[PDB]
Amino acid sequence: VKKTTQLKQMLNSKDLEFIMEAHNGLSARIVQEAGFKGIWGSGLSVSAQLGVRDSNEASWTQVVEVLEFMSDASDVPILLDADTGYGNFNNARRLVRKLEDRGVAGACLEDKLFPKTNSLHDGRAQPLADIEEFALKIKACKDSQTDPDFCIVARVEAFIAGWGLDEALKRAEAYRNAGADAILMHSKKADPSDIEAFMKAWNNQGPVVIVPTKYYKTPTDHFRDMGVSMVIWANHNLRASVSAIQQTTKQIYDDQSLVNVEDKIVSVKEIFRLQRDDELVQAEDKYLPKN
Amino acid sequence: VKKTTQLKQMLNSKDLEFIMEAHNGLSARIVQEAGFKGIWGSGLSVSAQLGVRDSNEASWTQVVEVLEFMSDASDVPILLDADTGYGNFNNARRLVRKLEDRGVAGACLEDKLFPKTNSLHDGRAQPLADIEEFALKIKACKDSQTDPDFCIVARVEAFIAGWGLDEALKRAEAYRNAGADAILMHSKKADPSDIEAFMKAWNNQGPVVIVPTKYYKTPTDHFRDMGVSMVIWANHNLRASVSAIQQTTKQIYDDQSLVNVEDKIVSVKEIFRLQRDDELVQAEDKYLPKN
Amino acid sequence: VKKTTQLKQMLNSKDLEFIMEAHNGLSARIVQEAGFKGIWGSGLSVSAQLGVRDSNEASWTQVVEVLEFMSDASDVPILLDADTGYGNFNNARRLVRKLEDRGVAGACLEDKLFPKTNSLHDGRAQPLADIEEFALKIKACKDSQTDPDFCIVARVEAFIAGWGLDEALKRAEAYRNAGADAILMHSKKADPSDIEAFMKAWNNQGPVVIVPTKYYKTPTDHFRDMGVSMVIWANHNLRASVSAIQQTTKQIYDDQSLVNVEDKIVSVKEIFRLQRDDELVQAEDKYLP
Amino acid sequence: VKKTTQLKQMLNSKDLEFIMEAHNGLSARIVQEAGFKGIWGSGLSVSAQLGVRDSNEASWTQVVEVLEFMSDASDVPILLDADTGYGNFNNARRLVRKLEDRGVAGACLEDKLFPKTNSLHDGRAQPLADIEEFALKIKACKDSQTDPDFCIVARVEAFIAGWGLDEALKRAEAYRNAGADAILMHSKKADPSDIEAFMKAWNNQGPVVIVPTKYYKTPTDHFRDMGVSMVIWANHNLRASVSAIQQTTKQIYDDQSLVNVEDKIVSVKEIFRLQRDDELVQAEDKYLP
Ligand SMILES: O=C([O-])C(=O)[O-]
Ligand SMILES: O=C([O-])C(=O)[O-]
Ligand SMILES: O=C([O-])C(=O)[O-]
Ligand SMILES: O=C([O-])C(=O)[O-]
Ligand SMILES: [Mg+2]
Ligand SMILES: [Mg+2]
Ligand SMILES: [Mg+2]
Ligand SMILES: [Mg+2]
Q: What are phi and psi of D183, to 5 degrees?
A: -110, 130
- Cα(D17)–Cα(D79) distance, integer angstroms: 13
Q: For the beta carbon of residue D285, count every other beta carbon within 10 angstroms.
A: 7
Cα–Cα distance between B252 and D6 in angstroms, integer?
58
Amino acid at the residue D81: D
C205-223 core/surface letters (b: 16 or more CB in 10 A; e: else): ebbbbbbbbbbbebebeeb
CA distance A267 to A221: 37
Gap between the Cα atoms of C272 and C277, Å rounded: 5
Nearest to D261 among C73, C236, C249 (CB): C236
B56 touches chain C (CB under 8 A): yes
Q: Choosing from B15, B54, B111, B166, which is the catalytic residue?
A: B54
Using an 8 Å Cβ cutoff, are C40 and C20 in contact?
Answer: yes
What is the radius of gyration, based on Cα positions, of chain C?
A: 20
CA–CA gap between residue D247 and residue C244 (Å, rounded): 11
SS3 helix, strand, coil % of chain D, rounded to 5? 45, 15, 40
Q: Transcribe chain C into DSSP letters.
A: --HHHHHHHHHHSSSPEEEEEE-SHHHHHHHHHHT-S-EEE-HHHHHHHTTS-TTT-S-HHHHHHHHHHHHHT-SS-EEEE-TT-SSSHHHHHHHHHHHHHHT--EEEEESBPSSP--TT-SS---PBPPHHHHHHHHHHHHHH-SSTT-EEEEEE-TTTTT--HHHHHHHHHHHHHTT-SEEEE---SSSSHHHHHHHHHHTT-S-EEE--STTTTS-HHHHHHTT--EEEE-SHHHHHHHHHHHHHHHHHHHHSSSTTTTTTS--HHHHHHHTTHHHHHHHHHHH--
Using CA atoms, how far apart are residues D46 and D66, in angstroms rounded to an integer?
A: 8
CB D76 within 8 A of CB D35: no
Distance (Å, rounded) from C-alpha A145 to C-alpha A5? 13
Alpha-carbon radius of gyration of chain A: 20
Which atom of ligand 4 approaches the CA of D118 most closely? 5
β-bridge mates for residue D40, sequence order: D21, D79
Is residue D133 within 8 angstroms of chain B, CB to CB?
A: yes
Nearest Cα residue in chain B from A19: B253
Ligand 2 lining (C-beta closer than 6 Å):
B 42-45, 81, 119, 211, 234-235
With beta carbons less than 8 A apart as the criterion, state whether D32 and D61 touch.
no
**Best mutation site among C23, C40, C210 for ligand 3 pocket (most ligand atoms within 8 Å of CB):** C40
Report the distance separating Cα B32 and Cα B70, nearest Å. Answer: 11
Q: How many CB atoms lie within 10 A of CB C283?
A: 16
**Of C38, C81, C27, which is closest to residue C236 (Cα–Cα)?**
C27
- In CATH, D1-289 is 3.90.226.10: no
Distance (Å) of CA A261 to CA A179, A257, B37, B220, C236: 51, 9, 20, 15, 61
CA distance B93 to D283: 10
The Cα D112–Cα D110 span in angstroms is 6
Nearest to C246 by CA among B24, D33, A38: D33
- Measured CA to CA, the distance from residue A171 to residue A177 in angstroms comes to 10
Chain A interface, best mutation among C277, C287, C288, by max A CB count within 10 A: C287
Phi first, then psi: give them for residue A5, nearest 5 degrees: -65, -40
- Say which amino acid occupies A34: A
The answer, for B94 touching chain C at a CB cutoff of 8 Å, is yes
The span from the CA of A167 to the CA of B56, in Å, is 52
Measuring CA to CA, how many Å separate D251 from each of B136, C25, C271, D270?
48, 20, 21, 22
Kind of pairing between the strands at A151-156 and A106-110:
parallel
Closest residue to D59, CB basis, from A60, A90, A114:
A60
CA angle C61, C54, C10 (to 5 degrees): 75
Name the β-bridge partners of C81: C108
Alpha-carbon gap, residue D134 to D142, rounded angstroms? 13
Cβ of A284 and C90 within 8 Å? yes
Residue B148, SS3 per DSSP = coil
Is-contact A229 A13, C-beta < 8 A? yes
Is residue D136 within 8 Å of residue B287, measured between CB atoms? yes
In contact, A138 and A144? CB cutoff 8 Å? no
Cβ atoms C130, C161 nearer than 8 A? no
A230: β partners: A17, A209
Return the number of other C-beta atoms located less than 10 Å from residue D71's C-beta: 26
Q: Is the CB of A27 under 6 A from ligand 1?
A: no
DSSP B153: E
Q: D250: number of CA atoms within 13 Å, CB side?
A: 6
C136/A287 touch (CB, cutoff 8 Å), yes or no = yes
Measured in residues, chain B has a length of: 291
Q: How far apart are CA D95 and CA B78, in angstroms?
A: 23
Positive or negative, the Cα torsion across D171, D172, D173, D178? positive
| A200-A201-A206-A209 Cα dihedral, nearest 10 degrees | -60
Q: Which residue of B has its CA nearest to A242?
A: B266
Residues of C in contact with D249 (CB under 8 A): 20, 30-31, 34, 36, 237
Report the distance separating Cα D283 and Cα C53, nearest Å: 13
Q: Could you give the angle at which helices D60-72 and D89-102 cross, rounded to 10 degrees? A: 20
Picking from D128, D135, D178, D185, the residue whose alpha carbon sits closest to that of residue D156 is: D185
Q: In this structure, what DSSP letter does residue D82 have?
A: -
Instruction: Give CA D44 to chain center in angstroms.
Output: 9
CB D67 within 8 A of CB D78: yes
C39 touches C106 (CB < 8 A):
no
**What is the residue with the minimal CA distance to atom 3 of ligand 4?**
D42
Answer whether B53 touches A (CB < 8 Å): yes
What type of residue sits at position A82? Answer: A
Sequence-separated (6 or more) residues with CB below 8 Å from residue B255:
none
CA distance C135 to C174: 6
Contact B42, A268 (CB under 8 A): no
Select from D194, D7, D220, D180 the least CA-distant residue to D119.
D194
Interface test mutation site (partner D, options C75, C268, C282, C287, max chain D beta carbons within 10 A): C268
Dist. CA C183–CA C188, nearest whole Å = 16
The shortest CB-CB distance from B130 to any of D132, D286, D289 is to D289
* Angle value at C-alpha B48, between B42 and B50, nearest 5 degrees: 105
Distance CA A287, CA C90 (A): 9
φ, ψ at C107 (rounded to 5°): -130, 145
Say what angle helices A131-143 and A89-101 make with each other, to 10 degrees: 30
Domain-wise residue ranges, chain C: 1-289
Calculated CA dihedral for residues B159, B161, B163, B164, nearest 10 degrees: 0
Is-contact D100 D74, C-beta < 8 A? no
Q: What are the angstrom distances between the C-alpha of B154 and each of B20, B131, B195, B198?
A: 18, 12, 15, 15
Spatial separation of the C-alpha atoms in residues C155 and B111, rounded to whole Å: 30
Q: Of D73, D135, D54, D86, nearest to D276 (Cα)? A: D73
- Is the CB of A188 inside 8 Å of chain B's CB atoms? no
- Element containing residue B1 per DSSP (H, E): none
CA angle D30, D31, D37 (to 5 degrees): 140
Residue type, D17: E
Per DSSP, helices labelled H in chain B are: 3-12, 25-34, 43-50, 60-72, 89-101, 131-143, 165-177, 193-202, 220-226, 236-255, 268-274, 277-287
CA–CA gap between residue D163 and residue D186 (Å, rounded): 12
Query: Does residue A160 have its Cβ closer than 6 Å to ligand 1?
Result: no
Answer yes or no: is the C-beta of D109 below 6 A from any ligand 4 atom. no
Q: How far is CA D179 from CA C4, C228, D26, D152, D153, in A?
A: 54, 65, 33, 8, 9
Q: What is the DSSP letter of D63?
A: H
Which residues on D lie below 8 Å from B130 (Cβ)?
289
Q: Hey, how many other C-beta atoms are within 10 angstroms of the C-beta on D225?
A: 12
Tell me which residue in A132, A287, A289 faces C139 most closely, judged by beta carbons.
A287
Please report, as a single letter, which amino acid is at residue D60: W
The resolution, in Å, is 1.8
What type of residue is A248? Answer: T
First to last CA, chain D: 35
Q: What is the 3-state secondary structure (H, E, C) of chain A?
A: CCHHHHHHHHHHCCCCEEEEEECCHHHHHHHHHHCCCCEEECHHHHHHHHCCCCCCCCCHHHHHHHHHHHHHCCCCCEEEECCCCCCCHHHHHHHHHHHHHCCCCEEEEECECCCCCCCCCCCCCCCECCHHHHHHHHHHHHHCCCCCCCEEEEEECCCCCCCCHHHHHHHHHHHHHCCCCEEEECCCCCCCHHHHHHHHHHCCCCCEEECCCCCCCCCHHHHHHHCCCEEEECCHHHHHHHHHHHHHHHHHHHHCCCCCCCCCCCCHHHHHHHCCHHHHHHHHHHHCCCC
Dist. CA C156–CA A190, nearest whole Å? 68
Measured distance CA(C248)–CA(C236) in Å, rounded: 18
Q: Which residues of D are catalytic?
A: 54
Given C62, C91, C115, which is nearest B91 (Cβ)?
C115
CA dist B104 → B67, B77, B85, B150, D78 (Å): 7, 7, 15, 8, 24
D205 SS3 class: coil
Collapsed DSSP state (helix, strand, coil) of residue D185: strand
Q: Say if ligand 4 is within 6 A of residue D235 CB.
A: yes
DSSP assignment of D1-59: --HHHHHHHHHHSSSPEEEEEE-SHHHHHHHHHHT-S-EEE-HHHHHHHTTS-TTT-S-
What are chain A's partners, defined as 3 or more CB pairs within 8 angstroms? B, C, D
Instruction: Tell me which ligand sits closest to the C-alpha of residue C40.
Output: 3
Cα–Cα dist D252/C216, whole Å: 12
DSSP letter at D122 equals S
| Contact: A90, D115; criterion CB under 8 Å | yes
- Residue C54 is labelled as binding a ligand: yes
Residues touching ligand 3 (Cβ under 6 Å) are C 42-45, 54, 81, 211, 234-235
Task: Please check whether the domain covering A1-291 is classified as CATH 3.20.20.60.
Answer: yes
Distance (Å, whole) CA B174 – CA B185:
13
* Whether C24 contacts D247, CB under 8 Å: no
D53 in contact with C, Cβ within 8 Å: yes
Cα B261 to Cα A50, A240, B250: the distances in Å are 23, 8, 10
Q: Say if residues D211 and D186 touch (Cβ distance below 8 Å).
A: yes
Looking from the CA of residue C110, the nearest atom of ligand 3 is: 5
Q: Does D202 touch chain A (CB under 8 A)?
A: no
CA A260 to chain centroid = 35
Nearest CA to A229 out of A249, A206, A257 is that of A206
In whole angstroms, how far apart are CA C274 and each of C68, C238, C281, D115? 17, 18, 14, 20
| Residue D47, φ and ψ in degrees, nearest 5 | -65, -45
In angstroms, the Cα distances linking C82 to A94, A288, C47 are 27, 20, 12
Q: Are B235 and B44 contacting, i.e. CB atoms less than 8 angstroms apart?
A: yes
Q: Report which of B82, A60, B93, D65 is spatially closest to residue C65, judged by C-alpha positions.
A: D65
Residues composing chain A: 291
User: Hey, are the CB atoms on D62 and A59 less than 8 Å from each other?
Assistant: yes
Question: Which among A117, A184, A235 is the best mutation to test ligand 1's pocket, defined by most ligand atoms within 8 Å of the CB?
Answer: A235
